[PDB]
Design an enzyme around this catalytic site. Structure first.
Site, PDB file in Angstrom:
ATOM      1  N   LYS A   1      -3.256   0.739  11.508  1.00 14.54           N
ATOM      2  CA  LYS A   1      -3.467   1.248  10.165  1.00 14.54           C
ATOM      3  C   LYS A   1      -3.517   2.754  10.246  1.00 14.54           C
ATOM      4  O   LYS A   1      -4.479   3.315  10.719  1.00 14.54           O
ATOM      5  CB  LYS A   1      -4.761   0.725   9.526  1.00 14.54           C
ATOM      6  CG  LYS A   1      -5.050   1.402   8.156  1.00 14.54           C
ATOM      7  CD  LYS A   1      -6.352   0.963   7.519  1.00 14.54           C
ATOM      8  CE  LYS A   1      -6.545   1.625   6.146  1.00 14.54           C
ATOM      9  NZ  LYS A   1      -6.677   3.123   6.114  1.00 14.54           N
TER      10      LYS A   1
ATOM     11  N   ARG B   4      -0.115   6.121   1.304  1.00 16.06           N
ATOM     12  CA  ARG B   4       0.774   5.008   1.067  1.00 16.06           C
ATOM     13  C   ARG B   4       1.853   5.509   0.149  1.00 16.06           C
ATOM     14  O   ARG B   4       1.540   6.070  -0.916  1.00 16.06           O
ATOM     15  CB  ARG B   4       0.056   3.863   0.398  1.00 16.06           C
ATOM     16  CG  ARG B   4       0.746   2.588   0.604  1.00 16.06           C
ATOM     17  CD  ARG B   4       0.016   1.471  -0.056  1.00 16.06           C
ATOM     18  NE  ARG B   4       0.698   0.219   0.219  1.00 16.06           N
ATOM     19  CZ  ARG B   4       0.118  -0.969   0.175  1.00 16.06           C
ATOM     20  NH1 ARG B   4      -1.160  -1.063  -0.133  1.00 16.06           N
ATOM     21  NH2 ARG B   4       0.818  -2.055   0.446  1.00 16.06           N
TER      22      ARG B   4
ATOM     23  N   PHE C 125       5.899  -0.213   6.740  1.00  7.56           N
ATOM     24  CA  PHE C 125       5.400  -1.567   6.950  1.00  7.56           C
ATOM     25  C   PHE C 125       5.968  -2.697   6.092  1.00  7.56           C
ATOM     26  O   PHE C 125       5.646  -3.858   6.343  1.00  7.56           O
ATOM     27  CB  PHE C 125       3.868  -1.609   6.951  1.00  7.56           C
ATOM     28  CG  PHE C 125       3.242  -0.954   5.766  1.00  7.56           C
ATOM     29  CD1 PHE C 125       2.794  -1.707   4.717  1.00  7.56           C
ATOM     30  CD2 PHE C 125       3.085   0.415   5.716  1.00  7.56           C
ATOM     31  CE1 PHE C 125       2.198  -1.106   3.630  1.00  7.56           C
ATOM     32  CE2 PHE C 125       2.503   1.017   4.640  1.00  7.56           C
ATOM     33  CZ  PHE C 125       2.057   0.262   3.592  1.00  7.56           C
TER      34      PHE C 125
ATOM     35  N   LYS D 100      -7.924  -5.201   6.633  1.00 16.20           N
ATOM     36  CA  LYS D 100      -8.272  -3.979   7.369  1.00 16.20           C
ATOM     37  C   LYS D 100      -9.288  -4.263   8.469  1.00 16.20           C
ATOM     38  O   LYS D 100     -10.161  -5.086   8.291  1.00 16.20           O
ATOM     39  CB  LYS D 100      -8.899  -2.952   6.422  1.00 16.20           C
ATOM     40  CG  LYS D 100      -7.948  -1.932   5.817  1.00 16.20           C
ATOM     41  CD  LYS D 100      -8.527  -1.315   4.526  1.00 16.20           C
ATOM     42  CE  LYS D 100      -8.609  -2.357   3.431  1.00 16.20           C
ATOM     43  NZ  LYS D 100      -9.776  -2.145   2.510  1.00 16.20           N
TER      44      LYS D 100
HETATM   45  N1  LIG Z   1       0.603  -0.024   8.346  1.00 16.28           N
HETATM   46  C1  LIG Z   1      -0.134  -0.164   7.216  1.00 16.28           C
HETATM   47  N2  LIG Z   1      -0.049  -1.278   6.454  1.00 16.28           N
HETATM   48  C2  LIG Z   1      -0.779  -1.427   5.327  1.00 16.28           C
HETATM   49  N3  LIG Z   1      -1.645  -0.504   4.856  1.00 16.28           N
HETATM   50  C3  LIG Z   1      -1.832   0.668   5.516  1.00 16.28           C
HETATM   51  C4  LIG Z   1      -1.066   0.898   6.760  1.00 16.28           C
HETATM   52  N4  LIG Z   1      -1.430   2.111   7.204  1.00 16.28           N
HETATM   53  C5  LIG Z   1      -2.344   2.613   6.335  1.00 16.28           C
HETATM   54  N5  LIG Z   1      -2.584   1.761   5.323  1.00 16.28           N
HETATM   55  C6  LIG Z   1      -3.546   2.011   4.230  1.00 16.28           C
HETATM   56  O1  LIG Z   1      -4.226   0.811   3.948  1.00 16.28           O
HETATM   57  C7  LIG Z   1      -4.331   0.655   2.515  1.00 16.28           C
HETATM   58  C8  LIG Z   1      -4.528  -0.801   2.164  1.00 16.28           C
HETATM   59  O2  LIG Z   1      -4.925  -0.958   0.803  1.00 16.28           O
HETATM   60  P1  LIG Z   1      -6.338  -0.412   0.279  1.00 16.28           P
HETATM   61  O3  LIG Z   1      -7.199  -0.008   1.459  1.00 16.28           O
HETATM   62  O4  LIG Z   1      -6.917  -1.392  -0.715  1.00 16.28           O
HETATM   63  O5  LIG Z   1      -5.904   0.833  -0.468  1.00 16.28           O
HETATM   64  C9  LIG Z   1      -3.062   1.301   1.998  1.00 16.28           C
HETATM   65  O6  LIG Z   1      -3.150   1.664   0.629  1.00 16.28           O
HETATM   66  C10 LIG Z   1      -2.862   2.492   2.941  1.00 16.28           C
HETATM   67  O7  LIG Z   1      -3.560   3.637   2.464  1.00 16.28           O
END
Ligand SMILES: Nc1ncnc2c1ncn2[C@@H]1O[C@H](COP(=O)(O)O)[C@@H](O)[C@H]1O
Length: 516
Positions: A206, A211, A296, A377
């Protein structure tokens, strides 16, 4: 249909704080329109916006200087903004005079409010979703879905009013029209994620970044931020880059834009957002802050909609579609049935220095605008919060020229107007507070003494020692010692954490008491 009717709606909505009353007023007005007026139109006026956040069309204005039907006024707006070339810069006074001669002092306040986005009207996007699904008697699940796939209110509005259930259900992806991000819930540790996912899973680093969403058609690439601003013009170099490394002609991909050190290692996402701002001249910036983009997902390729495809397949395709540089790469993944190498990846990623892991359900299809257990996450820390600055409070003495404290709201599905979840004074420096004060000043919708109620357009990310249940705020929710982390400009009001969000993080927290 003309601007007096919409003015009457503005007034009807002015008088009430009460949800279904607003829903009923809007919905009534939408029911009142036959569509040469088409409602491409209206919904954004209702919102108070002019054009969608993703439009790439901007006109705003020296409004104190310019100060000496509906279809008419959208026409006026397209014909001021679009209007690309040299003969007009300020101008627009005659453009604004063209309509204004017959315009009432009644309406003028709303014209200019719409112009500077100075319209404070209290309609949430969810409230408008309710309003459309009411007025045209469609399943709101559908106005939901079609909004999530397009992010065009007008479009879902017309489809609703004409085609209904029907067409809404059949609605699909269009390049240059942004799809809402599918979102993650949280996991405790790796082994846990492995459990929820039913024994196997995808894992991804992550990354810490913005995003972003990329829409490629031919030689025209459009790139969007999380708040769905069109960030293309600002990052030309990742434009050229993403052209070349993307094999297909019609693609929609999703990735994380990370400012990196030349070390090959991530800078805080705060820099990538600096890059979106285009404060300086991009010549300088593109060297001062380089960016890598780690893809991704694939939402669309070659006239194919990928939403309904499992993760496993979408991933294989995504890998297939991109031939990677050091400047563009398919996000690092591992698909394993066992937690050992998983947490080995977790550590490798931590010492790599971004955020954590993501854990993707392999059989998961894609659900735009949905936080779920399909994606999870995994972090060392507890998730921080992005919430709207709801109100503020000034300082005293020399600091009377400063907003020192910041009243923070979250969103409540049965309310609208943004319930307060707390107030935050810690974490800011001086220039942070000059910034917030100067910027927030325009947004004040109420003045009580040295304390202030703000028109909630500003999202900041704050951290907290503990979430507790306090009905010393409406939400029955409060934060134990909040502190400024940054302002997320890549999130706007509709992107901010809800109340149910808070609930869920809390639940995770007591599980990190119980599970610890
Ligand atoms: N490889 C990845 N795949 C998915 N989400 C990621 C990745 N790297 C960073 N992110 C963060 O993880 C968030 C997942 O959604 P949220 O935390 O609800 O905003 C995304 O909006 C990105 O800011």
């Amino acid at each position: 249909s003309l601007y007096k009717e919409l003015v009457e709606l503005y007034k009807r909505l002015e008088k009430t704080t009460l949800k279904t009353l607003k829903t009923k007023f809007v919905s009534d007005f939408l029911k009142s329109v036959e569509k040469p007026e088409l409602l491409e139109v209206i919904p954004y006026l209702i919102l108070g916006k002019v054009f969608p956040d993703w439009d790439e069309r901007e006109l705003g204005i020296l409004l104190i200087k310019a100060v000496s039907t509906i279809e008419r006024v959208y026409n006026t707006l397209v014909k001021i903004a679009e209007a690309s070339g040299a003969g007009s810069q300020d101008r627009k006074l005659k453009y604004l005079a063209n309509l204004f001669m017959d315009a009432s002092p009644d309406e003028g306040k709303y014209l200019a409010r719409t112009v500077l986005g100075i319209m404070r009207t209290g309609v949430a996007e969810g409230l408008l979703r309710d309003a459309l699904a009411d007025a045209f008697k469609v399943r709101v699940e559908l106005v939901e879905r079609a909004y999530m796939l397009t992010s065009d209110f007008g479009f879902v509005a017309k489809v609703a009013k004409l085609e209904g259930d029907e067409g809404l259900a059949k609605v699909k992806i269009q390049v240059g029209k942004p799809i809402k991000p599918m979102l993650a819930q949280m996991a405790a540790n790796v082994r846990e994620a492995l459990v929820e996912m039913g024994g196997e899973a995808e894992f991804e680093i992550k990354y810490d970044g913005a995003r972003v969403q990329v829409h490629k058609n031919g030689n025209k690439v459009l790139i969007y931020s999380r708040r769905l601003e069109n960030v293309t013009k600002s990052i030309p170099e990742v434009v050229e880059r993403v052209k070349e490394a993307l094999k297909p002609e019609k693609v929609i991909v999703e990735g994380e834009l990370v400012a990196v050190e030349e070390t090959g290692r991530p800078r805080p996402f705060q820099y990538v957002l600096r890059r979106f701002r285009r404060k300086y001249n991009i010549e300088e910036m593109i060297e001062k802050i380089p960016l890598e983009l780690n893809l991704f997902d694939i939402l669309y390729v070659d006239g194919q909609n990928m939403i309904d495809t499992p993760f496993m397949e979408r991933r294989k395709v995504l890998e297939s579609v991109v031939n990677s540089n050091e400047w563009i790469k398919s996000a690092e993944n591992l698909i394993t049935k066992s937690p050992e190498e998983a947490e080995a990846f977790y550590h490798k990623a931590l010492d790599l220095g971004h955020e954590g892991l993501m854990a993707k359900r392999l059989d998961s299809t894609y659900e735009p605008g949905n936080r779920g257990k399909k994606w999870l996450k995994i972090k060392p820390t507890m998730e921080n919060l992005d919430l709207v600055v709801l109100g503020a409070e000034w300082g005293e003495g020399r600091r009377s020229g400063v907003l020192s404290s910041f009243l923070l709201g979250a969103y409540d599905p049965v309310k609208g107007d943004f319930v307060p979840v707390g107030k935050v004074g810690s974490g800011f420096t001086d220039e942070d507070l000059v910034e917030f004060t100067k910027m927030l000043k325009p947004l004040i919708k109420k003045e009580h003494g040295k304390e202030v109620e703000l028109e909630p357009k500003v999202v900041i990310e704050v951290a907290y020692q503990e979430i507790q249940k306090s009905p010393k705020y409406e939400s029955g929710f409060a934060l134990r010692f909040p502190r400024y982390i940054a302002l997320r400009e890549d999130k706007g009001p509709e992107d901010a954490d809800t109340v149910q969000r808070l609930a869920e993080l809390y639940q995770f927290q007591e599980r990190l008491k119980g599970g610890r």
